[PDB]
């Protein structure tokens, strides 16, 4: 049952099983989902546990009076979410940059997502929507635009459907929007001005933003062709 | 004031001003934000206006005892997020496929995203992490993996704040990331033309009646 | 009028006068519509009358108190154009095959019409929507897809009792099996070549004509190789 | 059974499962067809789920006291008919025209289906029955003749067992047959470029106000 | 303020200062707009000065007890709108015609704006949306379509906040749009010299008395 | 009539019949004009009805004491032609640029339309009045000048309360900003060359997209050099 304590005893036996076999320390405290399925039954539970205080959604799968004093052994302990830095991929390791080279510019230096998308559809709409990879900045820019598209359909999903679920809309509109603004800015600018120009402009704007306000020249470096 | 009636009247003035000027019909429901800036009061409203069955947010800039007895005037009603469908981009058009060719295969054909990320990290990790454009498949694979990373980071954020959204991600964005990861991993392994032929072969194999096709499903291997 | 005995007598003497003049076997039941044009009434006798026993239509036109006792004579008795196929066209005869070559394939050899349409779309959509011909198979495929679409708008329209529910059943199975044969033949002649599909239909005819006891237990499969 | 309460509850459960997986407003009204098969009991449930006032044939498959204490599992909400606009074929686009261009010609410009079928059977019956491709217009004309044949056999079928659907075909579905037959007969008779220039000049004729249009509407001729 | 006596005396002083510098008969009636800015106090005075029965929007700028014991200094009497006939552009003169020549055709010869816009969207929509110059007629036709778009958005704007100005556009400003659309669609379809000879021959047709003109008014055709 | 409930019932059953037949969302308030043609009244139902909530027009035509109890059916429901731009034309797309490239320039970057017209006149009047093309910029410049002139005759006509005073304000600012963008773009592409104006719009977009804190304090200037 969902409310009964037998699922809690089941995944609690699973969690001290873990702390015995794999030198683990997890604090299973509650169950959101615990499926029941008869074949002996085939339970499917998820166990949420503090990992040094940090929560993580796992999945429990144990082949089990008659449901407590039975043959009891877990077989799989698969967690939910492989996106845990298991590959440290840098979006800008190709093309010459790094991530921390793109931290020379401040956070609110980048244009909006609307202004960058108007820029991309201004100068490069024919080359983006095209049956050829023109250049690697296009292959990255197409994926960046579609990623922002599916993020905004998720935003209108959670906006259409408790009642204070606008905070997640603000979270996607800012915190992932910043990464997509950097990733759009970098590729539009490397397409327009050349890749060496953006990479040395990043250093020159770095130097400009290093210096204190009393000694900073009043005209920042800027990308131009004039 | 952050929850007054005057910001609600300002939101009604903004929504009927946009309705009269830019020729739309937006039914305002609720306000989510109001930033006061004294220079005359320069307000900064963001309100959600119901539109045809879709509750969507809208940023506003109005400038207005002394507050309501003043010349209020709307300067901007642009929405949030540019995704109104202004670019038609396939993820698979520079490669030779289309999106309909990858929905030719069944939905549950594609291995789950855990298995595909393990397949990617077990086989191309020293090229998906190196400073080269080895191929466009690597260049699209990197952005697909990092987009899934942002999506799962958002999933753990919503879990640790405020669920149906965590499985909504896996049903909807998970299927497109499964097709994308499958396509690029298989195109790196077996070649691109071999995957483009396998797609139509497995498609027409799953369409035929079972008594008139080869009995075992197509696999691609070496 | 419409339900009067005068229109029925008009049509009775019409079918009997056809029996005098042009000598075909004919009998009559019902007029479905009789418009009038008085100038001497130039009737429009859309009368159903049986050449061969069946309820087919004969639009007639006669020159007729005084409406009974006057001259009655036929100048027009013609049906609606192509009665049952005045020309005998074979939809595969230009492509090598015939209908007699494809009448051996069973009713469930063909995938469902959604699956044939999805195969056609998802495998040749850029060539079925181009302004070029590129093949006669693409031309017949375009017309076949549009004919099925026109028929599906009818299937939607009739849904707007069980009468409409069996009309949808008719237009999905009975016609629709012809759409599936046409769609299969054209996307298979494009996929595998055309001589390969004709050789496959020959050898599948040999397989399906054999009794179940004296043939290999599973049908030939189509693939180009 | 077919008309009892269990398949109604099963179809309502299937339509709310569809509202869980695809998240729409599908309103179930009546079960169309139903098959009850033992295996555990399998069902081939043809239900009708109305969509905001429009009706389309849909399907359900929910494998189910002993049949009700079981895992009720839905697998599909497939449509019956692939006419969801998934492919936009233009029947004239391969021939230089479009349906934008054949609406210069009004609805009642076109000759009747009888008058076009006997023009085809008078002028091209040898080559519309011959085993070669003489043109793309021949291939496109054979199909239109045969599709009218299927429409007429559906008309005489529905006139045998049960109204006004017989004159839904001959007008509303017969209009596009008349357009196709006119276009292909006229392109075989007068040439293709002559039919395109005729469509343009008939657009100029029907475009002008009635005070200044000439009374002789433009016509195709060769002599 | 806006409606008091000081801006009325200020506007009358501005209009007699205009009668001192340009020496005409401009009759001030009412202040249209007014802005009061401190500096000494600056004014952006939009006054209306009627000119012998005709009205045109004009402007005044008179920089002024303490505000009235000051040097009241006018600097401009500028018009609002450069349509004083300062440049005489003919929209057809680059194409061989003139508006003297397109008045052979009467007012109601021209097809409606709908019937010309869908002829353009049926026959040239690919090249009227493509990033190259295919002709001067294409460049001249894109602008006429977009100017009709601006006229229609002004029509639906004035139909949202407040009459009969909505049918001032569609008739009186729509007539020149119909003339431009007819001229450019017909020059793209039939050639340019054919449209000039058609204008000449329609002048011959509408010129003759009704006893001897043929009933078929001349028409453009290619077949 | 005009204000009768019969015309409103005609238009109500018209919009409901559109909902049955062609399946669009629709609701109705007002008929603005209903002409009549009796032969059986062939009405001209210029009824405003909302596809999407807005007050757009539907000119309809119906065949209808006996005027209530008769057959009512639609054969015509069409709006006025180009509803909102059936074709999507970009006024700068042939000239290299787009509207997305020029939407970054602020509203006061452009000189007033008198100053752009005086620049056009006093700098290219002999070439804007010649019978030669000489450029597509001259062609678009001629049409832009004439469009503004036609709009200014309307601004004069509406002046012949505050309603006309805000209509003149609309036609001077809202349209008129488009005239200023068009006039600026064409006289600047003629003055400075065309690639120079496109490069200037790129670099001005970079300047205006930057926040005020992280850009040089004054905009790029346009000159050929």
Residue numbers in the entry:
A (entry chain D): 14 to 52, 59 to 83, 89 to 185, 194 to 258
B (entry chain C): 14 to 52, 59 to 83, 89 to 186, 198 to 257
C (entry chain B), F (entry chain B): 14 to 52, 59 to 83, 89 to 184, 194 to 258
D (entry chain A), E (entry chain A): 14 to 52, 59 to 83, 89 to 186, 198 to 258
Text lifted from the article:
Here we describe an alternative form, termed N-VelcroVax, a VLP vaccine platform assembled from a monomeric HBc protein (N-anti-SUMO Affimer HBc 190) with the Affimer inserted at the N-terminus. HBc protein monomers comprise either 183 or 185 amino acids and dimerise to produce structural subunits which assemble to form icosahedral VLPs with T = 3 (90 dimers) or T = 4 (120 dimers) morphologies.
N-VelcroVax VLP samples were vitrified for cryo-EM data collection. This confirmed two different sizes of icosahedral particles. Reconstructions of each particle stack with icosahedral symmetry imposed revealed that these corresponded to T = 3 and T = 4 configurations, as expected. Unstructured internal density was also observed, possibly representing non-specific binding of nucleic acid derived from the E. coli expression system. Processing of cryo-EM data yielded density maps for T = 3 and T = 4 VLPs resolved to 3.0 Å and 3.5 Å, respectively. Initial inspection of density maps revealed no additional density attributable to bound SUMO-gp1, although there appeared to be a subtle change in the orientations of the Affimers, with these being closer together in the N-VelcroVax:SUMO-gp1 complex map compared to the unliganded N-VelcroVax map. However, for N-VelcroVax, in which Affimers are attached at the N-terminus and spatially constrained between the four-helix bundles, Affimer density was resolved.
